[PDB]
Amino acid sequence: MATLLTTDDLRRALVESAGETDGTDLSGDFLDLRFEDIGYDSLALMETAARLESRYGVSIPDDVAGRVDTPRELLDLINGALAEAA
Numbered sequence: 001m002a003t004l005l006t007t008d009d010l011r012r013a014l015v016e017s018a019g020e021t022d023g024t025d026l027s028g029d030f031l032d033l034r035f036e037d038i039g040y041d042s043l044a045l046m047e048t049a050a051r052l053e054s055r056y057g058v059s060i061p062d063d064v065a066g067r068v069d070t071p072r073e074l075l076d077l078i079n080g081a082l083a084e085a086a
């Protein structure tokens, strides 16, 4: 019932927020990899965040989206706010 955002969910959703950036690798452990390695833009991540905010019912300050380095931190932001909604 509580749709805790997993690595597999993120692997989908992250791609769902990238349009022209198709063809990266998000399958060979991207969780500790950096957004620069996975070819993610700055705006793309704001967008990724907003996507997740609106779907899961959370919120993340847009600057904090640019403060993350690795996807696990972004993921932490989501599930963190999600766990506050409980």
Ligand SMILES: *[PH](O)(O)OCC(C)(C)[C@H](O)C(=O)NCCC(=O)NCCSCCC(=O)CCCC(C)=O
Binding pocket: 041, 042, 043, 066
């Ligand atoms: P990232 O690490 O490249 O950082 C991006 C950003 C926007 C957080 C940062 O503040 C920045 O790029 N600052 C430079 C000054 C500036 O005004 N940048 C704008 C760049 S993109 C879009 C700006 C905007 O006002 C509206 C965009 C609306 C859309 C894309 O729909």
